[PDB]
Amino acid sequence: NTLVKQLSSKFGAISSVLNDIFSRLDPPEAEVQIDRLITGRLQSLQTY
Amino acid sequence: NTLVKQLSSKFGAISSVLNDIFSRLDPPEAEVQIDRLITGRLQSLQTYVTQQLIRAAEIRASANLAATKMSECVLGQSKRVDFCGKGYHLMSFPQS
Amino acid sequence: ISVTTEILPVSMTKTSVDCTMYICGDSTECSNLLLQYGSFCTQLKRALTGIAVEQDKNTQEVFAQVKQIYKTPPIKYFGGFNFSQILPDPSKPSKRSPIEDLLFNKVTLADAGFIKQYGDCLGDIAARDLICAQKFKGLTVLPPLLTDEMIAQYTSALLAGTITSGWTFGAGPALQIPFPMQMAYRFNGIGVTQNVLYENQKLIANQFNSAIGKIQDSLSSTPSALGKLQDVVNHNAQALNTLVKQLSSKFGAISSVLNDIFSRLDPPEAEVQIDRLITGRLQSLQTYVTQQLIRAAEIRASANLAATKMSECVLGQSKRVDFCGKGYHLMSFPQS
Amino acid sequence: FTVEKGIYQTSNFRVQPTESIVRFPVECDFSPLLSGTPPQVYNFKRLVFTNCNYNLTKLLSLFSVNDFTCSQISPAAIASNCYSSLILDYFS
Amino acid sequence: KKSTNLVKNKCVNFNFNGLKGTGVLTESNKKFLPFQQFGRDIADTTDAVRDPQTLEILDITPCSFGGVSVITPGTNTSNQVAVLYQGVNCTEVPTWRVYSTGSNVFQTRAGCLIGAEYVNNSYECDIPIGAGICASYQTSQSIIAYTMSLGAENSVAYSNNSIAIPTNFT
Ligand SMILES: *[C@@H]1O[C@H](CO)[C@@H](O[C@@H]2O[C@H](CO)[C@@H](O)[C@H](O)[C@H]2NC(C)=O)[C@H](O)[C@H]1NC(C)=O
Numbered sequence: 001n002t003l004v005k006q007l008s009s010k011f012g013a014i015s016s017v018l019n020d021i022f023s024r025l026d027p028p029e030a031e032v033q034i035d036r037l038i039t040g041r042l043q044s045l046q047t048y
Numbered sequence: 049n050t051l052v053k054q055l056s057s058k059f060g061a062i063s064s065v066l067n068d069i070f071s072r073l074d075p076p077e078a079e080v081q082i083d084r085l086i087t088g089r090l091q092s093l094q095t096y097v098t099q100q101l102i103r104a105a106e107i108r109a110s111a112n113l114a115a116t117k118m119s120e121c122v123l124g125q126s127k128r129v130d131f132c133g134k135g136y137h138l139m140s141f142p143q144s
Numbered sequence: 145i146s147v148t149t150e151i152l153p154v155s156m157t158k159t160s161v162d163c164t165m166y167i168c169g170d171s172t173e174c175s176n177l178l179l180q181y182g183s184f185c186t187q188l189k190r191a192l193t194g195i196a197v198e199q200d201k202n203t204q205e206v207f208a209q210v211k212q213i214y215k216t217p218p219i220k221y222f223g224g225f226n227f228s229q230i231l232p233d234p235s236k237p238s239k240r241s242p243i244e245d246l247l248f249n250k251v252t253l254a255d256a257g258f259i260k261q262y263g264d265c266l267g268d269i270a271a272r273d274l275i276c277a278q279k280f281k282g283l284t285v286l287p288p289l290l291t292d293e294m295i296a297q298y299t300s301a302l303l304a305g306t307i308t309s310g311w312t313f314g315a316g317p318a319l320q321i322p323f324p325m326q327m328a329y330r331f332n333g334i335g336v337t338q339n340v341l342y343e344n345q346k347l348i349a350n351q352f353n354s355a356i357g358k359i360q361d362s363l364s365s366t367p368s369a370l371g372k373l374q375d376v377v378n379h380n381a382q383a384l385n386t387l388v389k390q391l392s393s394k395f396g397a398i399s400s401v402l403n404d405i406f407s408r409l410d411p412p413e414a415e416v417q418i419d420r421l422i423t424g425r426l427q428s429l430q431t432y433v434t435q436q437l438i439r440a441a442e443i444r445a446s447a448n449l450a451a452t453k454m455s456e457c458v459l460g461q462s463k464r465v466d467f468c469g470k471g472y473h474l475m476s477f478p479q480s
Numbered sequence: 481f482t483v484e485k486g487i488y489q490t491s492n493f494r495v496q497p498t499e500s501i502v503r504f505p506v507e508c509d510f511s512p513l514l515s516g517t518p519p520q521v522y523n524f525k526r527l528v529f530t531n532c533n534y535n536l537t538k539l540l541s542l543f544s545v546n547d548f549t550c551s552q553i554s555p556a557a558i559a560s561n562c563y564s565s566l567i568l569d570y571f572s
Numbered sequence: 573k574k575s576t577n578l579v580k581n582k583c584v585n586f587n588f589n590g591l592k593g594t595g596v597l598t599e600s601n602k603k604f605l606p607f608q609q610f611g612r613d614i615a616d617t618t619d620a621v622r623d624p625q626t627l628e629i630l631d632i633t634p635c636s637f638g639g640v641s642v643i644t645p646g647t648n649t650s651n652q653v654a655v656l657y658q659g660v661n662c663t664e665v666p667t668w669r670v671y672s673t674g675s676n677v678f679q680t681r682a683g684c685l686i687g688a689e690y691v692n693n694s695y696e697c698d699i700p701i702g703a704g705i706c707a708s709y710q711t712s713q714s715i716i717a718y719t720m721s722l723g724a725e726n727s728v729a730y731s732n733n734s735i736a737i738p739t740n741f742t
Pocket residue numbers: 226227228229
């Protein structure tokens with residue numbers, strides 16, 4: 001349950017939905033937010 | 049000690065003081081520095097917790113062995129070789 | 145009379161790491177940016193040193209039981225019993241028994257001994273051997289404290305003591321006793337009167353010799369029979385290979401070469417790339433260290449069990465069910 | 481200030497290099513940019529360079545260099561990388 | 573651009589056809605191809621090179637390195653130390669840490685020891701060096717290195733009809 005619930009976290013990004021980031025902001029700055037989100041999810045998996 | 053000594057690292061930020069990071073610049077680019085500091089501190093805490101868990105497991109194994117020795121050598125007489133001292137076991141006495 | 149076998153891991157491979165060469169290499173600016181971090185490599189060195197000393201402690205605890213060196217008498221007659229398949233063989237230059245040779249030729253190590261000394265990986269020899277490739281990133285493998293010529297001596301001393309003095313050498317001075325009387329003592333121990341042995345000595349000796357020959361032959365014609373001692377080597381090699389291969393990742397940076405980030409660009413935007421690479425490599429090192437810690441704990445548990453079995457089954461007779469073999473226990477013999 | 485009997489680890493050691501090997505071993509044309517009327521933006525004129533040695537400051541010194549803005553590259557680093565692959569579009 | 577001389581057999585800054593770095597190079601037995609100009613390895617590292625001018629194959633091997641260990645008997649007793657260079661033939665080392673070597677160089681299987689004398693006796697292991705070699709501080713006093721011993725030697729007088737029975741306890 002903790003692993004499932006952890007999916008809804010910003011991790012310092014602009015949004016938690018991959019569609020909302022790929023809709024308004026150009027890729028050069030979207031890459032940073034996606035990198036932060038992916039790093040956070042990797043950390044969650046490693047701890048689990 | 050290590051944990052406390054981990055509080056004097058800016059983790060690539062311009063400074064390691066929250067008030068200094070907040071001031072002297074615009075908060076939108078202060079957020080990245082704040083998140084860098086938060087991630088560093090969280091990583092330090094996670095490492096500390098993991099090492100504590102491993103050490104706790106080791107101590108638990110030692111405590112189980114001690115309890116077994118107290119049950120067998122002290123409360124009775126054991127024929128297991130070299131379990132309760134070298135030679136032919138006669139009796140054991142505990143001390144704290 | 146049945147003779148069974150039991151295999152137990154006792155130790156793993158000692159390793160050392162170096163952040164200065166692995167993380168950055170020959171770049172001083174990356175070294176300064178790593179020094180910017182407080183302390184993320186003292187802990188790794190301390191943990192690896194602890195594991196390295198723990199391995200030697202495990203081996204010493206398991207094998208260094210008796211602080212004496214007993215020798216079997218020159219005349220090898222023990223009432224018809226025939227132990228030539230476990231006692232040392234003087235013919236070979238190595239002093240290993242004819243059974244230990246089978247156990248040594250069925251496990252493929254990485255590099256027996258250490259003759260590299262950064263003098264063998266010369267020219268095309270480097271980057272083809274796995275050992276050189278690992279050694280050229282900052283990872284080294286330390287040799288064990290006790291060589292293979294001392295564990296054999298320890299096992300030979302234990303065998304000579306247990307076949308010339310019974311179990312009396314594990315609880316004080318060693319007292320000799322003829323073997324066909326030690327057999328009677330053990331038979332009386334399990335609950336059978338001693339005249340059975342004195343009337344069936346020849347049959348018992350023949351059965352024992354047949355069992356020893358059977359296990360000697362069957363230890364070879366078998367698919368693996370030694371997976372426990374191969375898994376440690378395979379796991380160590382796999383972990384080191386993965387750690388080495390992790391360097392090729394980009395971790396979101398524009399390039400995977402440190403010389404194309406410090407140069408070929410400007411500092412204010414190269415700092416981000418260098419920070420990303422450093423953080424990724426540090427996280428990889430942390431994962432490797434944690435995995436090593438867990439595996440070391442498991443190996444320690446196995447070594448403690450092996451030490452208990454050596455103390456109880458060999459240096460005495462055990463009444464615990466299914467502990468030292470299946471059936472009514474008579475004795476055991478160790479091999480490395 | 482006091483240490484006990486034993487063996488400890490200290491700073492590592494490295495063998496430094498001594499000399500420097502170098503065994504590195506043309507003048508492609510810039511004329512089409514200088515020749516002809518520069519077209520408009522929707523009809524930009526492109527030149528592809530390959531296997532040649534270029535000279536940027538020689539061409540730019542002739543003109544009046546007003547502004548220079550880049551992405552994933554800088555003017556400092558634009559005169560340092562290898563030939564690789566190079567395409568220049570000029571327009572009015 | 574320009575060109576310089578070609579040296580070999582000494583680990584120096586190489587710059588074969590642009591590619592920079594460091595490493596020692598020796599002879600090799602390997603075949604490139606007329607369209608092949610650059611080597612690689614199992615982990616994305618250059619192994620061999622073809623001369624851009626002379627058109628033959630050499631290799632690449634970074635200079636030697638390793639850790640450094642200091643063996644001391646304790647500052648309370650004395651102030652002498654010995655230095656162990658892990659995994660490096662010291663007939664081939666002569667930079668970091670100490671810039672000055674000395675005498676009494678002993679070659680072991682775990683590196684080589686500087687400042688310790690090798691004897692032929694056998695005592696118990698005091699400071700573990702490795703590969704069966706130990707070190708100690710003893711008598712004029714100095715640091716010595718030896719091979720550890722396993723214990724005393726005795727043989728049990730096994731015989732056809734002989735048994736030893738104790739007569740007293742403790
Ligand atoms: C003890 O076991 C060894 C091993 O089987 C016996 O040695 C064999 O002896 C026969 C007859 O001389 C030879 O044909 C075999 O080649 C020997 N085996 C080996 C491995 O050399 C030995 O006879 C047995 N008994 C004694 C008293 O030594």
